[PDB]
Design a protein around this motif. Structure first.
Motif, PDB file in Angstrom:
ATOM      1  N   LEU B  74      -4.253   0.066 -13.331  1.00 21.16           N
ATOM      2  CA  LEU B  74      -4.289  -1.351 -12.987  1.00 21.16           C
ATOM      3  C   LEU B  74      -4.342  -2.243 -14.219  1.00 21.16           C
ATOM      4  CD1 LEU B  74      -6.760  -1.396  -9.942  1.00 21.16           C
ATOM      5  CD2 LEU B  74      -4.291  -1.765  -9.883  1.00 21.16           C
ATOM      6  N   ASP B  75      -4.745  -1.704 -15.369  1.00 18.09           N
ATOM      7  CA  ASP B  75      -4.810  -2.496 -16.590  1.00 18.09           C
ATOM      8  C   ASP B  75      -3.453  -2.678 -17.255  1.00 18.09           C
ATOM      9  OD1 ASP B  75      -7.564  -2.955 -16.471  1.00 18.09           O
ATOM     10  OD2 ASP B  75      -8.023  -1.079 -17.518  1.00 18.09           O
ATOM     11  N   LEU B 119       1.217  -5.659  -8.603  1.00 19.29           N
ATOM     12  CA  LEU B 119      -0.088  -5.184  -8.155  1.00 19.29           C
ATOM     13  C   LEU B 119       0.077  -4.123  -7.078  1.00 19.29           C
ATOM     14  CD1 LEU B 119      -2.448  -8.308  -8.022  1.00 19.29           C
ATOM     15  CD2 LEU B 119      -2.893  -6.141  -9.183  1.00 19.29           C
ATOM     16  N   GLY B 120       1.020  -4.334  -6.155  1.00 15.83           N
ATOM     17  CA  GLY B 120       1.247  -3.345  -5.115  1.00 15.83           C
ATOM     18  C   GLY B 120       1.720  -2.021  -5.684  1.00 15.83           C
ATOM     19  N   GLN B 121       2.660  -2.075  -6.634  1.00 10.43           N
ATOM     20  CA  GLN B 121       3.155  -0.849  -7.251  1.00 10.43           C
ATOM     21  C   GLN B 121       2.053  -0.153  -8.039  1.00 10.43           C
ATOM     22  OE1 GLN B 121       6.757  -1.452  -9.467  1.00 10.43           O
ATOM     23  NE2 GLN B 121       7.903  -2.245  -7.706  1.00 10.43           N
ATOM     24  N   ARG B 129       0.115   7.538  -3.809  1.00 10.44           N
ATOM     25  CA  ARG B 129       0.901   7.471  -2.588  1.00 10.44           C
ATOM     26  C   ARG B 129       2.244   6.811  -2.870  1.00 10.44           C
ATOM     27  NH1 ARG B 129      -3.656   5.757   1.986  1.00 10.44           N
ATOM     28  NH2 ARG B 129      -5.419   6.860   1.018  1.00 10.44           N
ATOM     29  N   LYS B 130       3.255   7.198  -2.096  1.00  8.91           N
ATOM     30  CA  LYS B 130       4.586   6.638  -2.273  1.00  8.91           C
ATOM     31  C   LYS B 130       4.591   5.148  -1.942  1.00  8.91           C
ATOM     32  CE  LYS B 130       7.410  10.796  -1.631  1.00  8.91           C
ATOM     33  NZ  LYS B 130       8.503  11.419  -0.828  1.00  8.91           N
ATOM     34  N   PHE B 174       2.146   0.850   2.686  1.00  6.66           N
ATOM     35  CA  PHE B 174       3.033  -0.084   3.368  1.00  6.66           C
ATOM     36  C   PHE B 174       2.646  -1.505   2.973  1.00  6.66           C
ATOM     37  CE2 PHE B 174       5.438  -1.899   6.890  1.00  6.66           C
ATOM     38  CZ  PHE B 174       6.497  -1.018   6.985  1.00  6.66           C
ATOM     39  N   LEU B 175       3.535  -2.184   2.252  1.00  3.95           N
ATOM     40  CA  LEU B 175       3.290  -3.548   1.804  1.00  3.95           C
ATOM     41  C   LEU B 175       3.861  -4.542   2.807  1.00  3.95           C
ATOM     42  CD1 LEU B 175       2.264  -5.546  -0.294  1.00  3.95           C
ATOM     43  CD2 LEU B 175       4.444  -5.302  -1.499  1.00  3.95           C
TER      44      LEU B 175
END
Lengths: 529, 529
Positions: B74-75, B119-121, B129-130, B174-175
């Motif tokens: 995340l950084d 952020l989602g990726q 997770r995929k 799932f976004l």
């Protein structure tokens, strides 16, 4: 004709059905035995067969007859409240003779954030019937309660039929949430359908658009919940209104230490000895982190505390236990957002603190008055009606009559304009209960005497200086208690109502029953006039 | 019967299937073994078989359990922001015990142009997770989330089923993009379907129109993103709102030098030593070529620079390297389109600069007032509501009370009409936070004192001249910083909120906490009155 029509046919014989169910079964049988690849024809009949098999009949929940167990169950739902549960017990006693309601539906009303769902679940457990919920808010078409016409696939039954199919019992507890939020904008008024499903003379033969065959719904117990008392007139019949209110400091503390804390600890996957919160932290949260009648703020704060504690303990394997007290609480919540106590309010002149009665619990208001030079015109702000106009006129007349005693120049109403501002005047309060507040603010503007802080007032006024009684003293007292106000001025005629208020609220506030404008002016102003 | 029905049958035995999958497989088997040349009959069953083989089960992504690696991942997504990632980590910690969410879905909100997709990726990479996306904007029918009825070929499943079939894992990320843009205009409200696919008590048995057999979706993690906080009420449950904001000058510079520049260089097929951009060019682009909270303008400008550099170096074989600095930057972008700094604003009288709180980040507004000869009527423009009317009335009362001190003729409200214009008054700001601005503009129109430029103000006003606290100080401060404003006037009660604002924004602006109208009039007007 195909194999499908055979299997489906079996679902009609493998389930016992009464006269009405046998009638709809015969109708489906006549609709069956057709071509299975028929688009939108075999799927709809198959769905109807599944619904019928799911519709309950010849089976029910074992309804309990004893009342002691019901009381014991109601005593452990949220807190007990010792006020509403009693009424519930009364209803249960009335229903402890036959399975026919033939009366109200135990409607609950109050501000959001109270044990409404908990009360419904406790009633379901005490009555031994399965629990099922259905939201009435946002409903504006009969197609939501009832189904669609008997046509091609996709015409699913209404929400009620679906809930009944999922709950395989003929006597379930159907909860009606947000009954005051229901409207009528798509297809007439769905309230009629509700009556057909709630009136004991119509629920026995309630017909649906999809389930055109009458279904017996007299054994289904209904319960409604709401926030305000603005229930539609057709839905008011056969209904008992039970009003709920907020909680005190000790009551909220006990509620948090009894169910809020354990539920939040179990939800965050915490252990028994991982987080320990004392009463100081809860008191600080209720005093500087939430201002409401419910316990929503407490739940959110406890959830944030648990999440932060989990993250802190996970990233530090050397930490064995986390303890939050009334001092380090801010470290997990930040700077305080609310103020408690009016001791350091720095009493003002043009401002007056009053109590307001609201359908979701009383609150505190700060009414202001401005006396500027002009011709004597009257202006008001806050979306006030005619009642406020006549109340201000009466207050002005009283001030003109007592100007000599209060040291006010008799020519103030001729060379000076008055502007009264009442914030949130559109409150659901029928009647200008802020007469004394406006009168005191006017006397202050004309004399310059600052209104003593930490003082609350509410009540009607007359042209002779007499104070009239008002309603909703409990909510106003609770609001004054939450706001940290110790001195509260109420009408004298309402004194007899104090006997219906618990001691937990009266022991904290200093109430002074008054009946004349002179008493309120003496107990509210800093000086004698 | 034909050869096709045989091959398809093999696809049912070559794939391991659980109870629910075996049930749908048996249904398809009953639908198979028929005539293959059957138009719209064999193709639909073949597609159903392919979907089932593609639907994931008995297989999942290796979810990571450590949190240190999640923080390290995340950084390096966009910048880290040191504010939202922490919350994400908290959620991960709560999910570091079991595979059941049983709570929020980590909803992200903020102005467009931020690291939402990044952020989602990053979350997908940290959780192992995929990654899969699905847009919720523009959706107005349940036929978009769910499929069509089990009928002739062409009834493809919903978007969710397709995404799950393409991603062969039972626990994907799932976004849900543009959740605030979803509407309800074709078939009821699709939000219900979303709940059925998001509620842990309904996703385990989520049924589709095409995939009528219940499918387990409790292991699927959902994440939603939005621009404004106007999320539908039914979709607000089981959701945590995380608000994002803009970036400062140094923050945007570092973001451009860390990911924007390398991504744009690699996308334009550039070499490591072909284009070199210094910090001066980026600063000039942020100051005179873009005015927003995101980094969209920076990306577009860098793309244009790279394209122009490639074309210039290709048509000139004698050029070995292209360097763009803060001087030749215009040669690739043209004349500046925006102005930075209010030092040469030539302070006006009837105009006042104020801060506006918007759901996509605060901005700057120029409120105007006109005092023309008339009868004393009040006119306003900018699509203002009743709150603005009462605020203007209070400001007028304050001006009438202080006219003698400010040198204003007391008969201005009787022989002169006032017209207040508030540009972009329809901003999603609940409350007249521009009280001081309108009051200062009125005092200026009545006295002729020009309002000092390079000064910003915002806050509520009362009838006694007191300033009330407001919300969203961070967005207003960021807007003032981007606009080049150094002097900012905020209410005194909001001073305690400055502790929650980073030093990168406070060190650049000069904030002066005020509580009375006299202080704002003294610090805003050029002269003493």
């Amino acid at each position: 004709a195909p194999d499908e029509n055979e299997a489906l046919k079996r679902k009609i014989d493998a389930a016992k059905m009464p006269k009405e169910a046998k009638e709809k079964a015969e109708a489906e049988l006549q609709k069956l035995k057709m071509m299975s690849p028929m688009s939108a024809e075999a799927t709809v009949v198959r769905g109807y067969i599944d619904w019928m098999v799911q519709v309950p009949w010849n089976a029910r929940s074992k309804v309990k007859k004893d009342l002691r167990q019901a009381q014991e169950i109601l005593d452990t739902d949220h807190y007990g409240l010792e006020r509403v549960k009693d009424r519930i017990l009364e209803y249960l006693a009335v229903q402890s003779r036959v399975n026919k309601i033939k009366g109200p539906i135990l409607c609950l009303v109050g501000p959001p954030g109270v044990g409404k769902t908990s009360l419904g679940q406790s009633i379901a457990k005490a009555t031994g019937r399965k629990y099922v919920r259905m939201a009435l808010g946002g409903v504006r078409d009969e197609a939501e309660i009832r189904g669609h016409r008997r046509t091609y696939i996709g015409s699913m039954p209404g929400k009620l039929i679906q809930k009944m199919a999922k709950v395989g019992v003929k006597n379930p507890l159907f909860l009606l949430d947000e009954i005051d939020k229901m409207s009528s904008d798509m297809r007439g008024d769905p309230a009629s359908a509700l009556l057909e499903v709630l009136d004991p003379e119509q629920n026995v033969a309630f017909s649906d658009h999809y389930l055109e065959v009458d279904y017996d719904l007299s054994d289904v117990m209904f319960v409604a919940t709401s926030n305000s008392m603005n229930i539609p007139a057709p839905l008011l019949d056969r209904m008992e209104v039970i009003r709920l209110s907020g909680y005190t400091e000790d009551e909220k503390l006990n509620i948090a230490k009894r169910h809020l804390l354990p539920k939040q600890i179990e939800r965050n996957a915490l252990k028994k000895g991982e987080l320990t919160v004392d009463d100081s932290a809860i008191i600080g949260i209720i005093r500087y982190y939430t201002r409401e009648a419910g316990v929503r703020g407490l739940e959110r704060e406890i959830s944030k505390l648990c999440r932060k504690a989990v993250k802190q303990l996970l990233l530090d394997k050397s930490l064995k236990h986390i303890e939050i007290n009334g001092d380090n609480l801010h470290d997990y919540l930040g700077v305080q957002r609310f103020d408690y106590g009016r001791a350091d309010n720095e009493n003002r002149v043009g401002q007056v603190t009053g109590l307001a009665w609201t359908e979701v619990g009383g609150d505190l208001l700060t009414i202001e008055t401005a006396c500027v030079p002009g011709k004597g015109k009257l202006t008001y702000t806050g979306s006030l009606g005619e009642v406020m106009q006549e109340s201000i006129q009466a207050a002005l007349t009283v001030v003109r009559a007592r100007a000599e005693k209060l040291g006010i120049n008799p020519d103030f109403y001729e060379k000076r304009d008055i502007h009264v501002h009442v914030p949130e005047g559109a409150t659901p309060k029928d009647g200008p209960a802020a007469g004394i507040a406006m009168c005191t603010a006017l006397v202050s503007c004309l004399t310059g005497n600052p209104v003593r802080a930490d003082v609350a007032m509410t009540g009607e006024i007359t042209l002779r200086g007499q104070v009239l009684p008002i309603g909703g003293l409990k909510e106003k007292l609770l609001a004054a208690h939450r706001g940290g106000i110790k001195t509260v001025l109420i009408p004298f005629e309402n004194k007899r109502d104090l006997e219906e208020i618990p001691d937990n609220v009266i022991a904290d506030l200093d109430i002074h029953p008054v009946k004349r404008i002179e008493e309120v002016l003496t107990l509210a102003l800093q000086n004698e006039p």
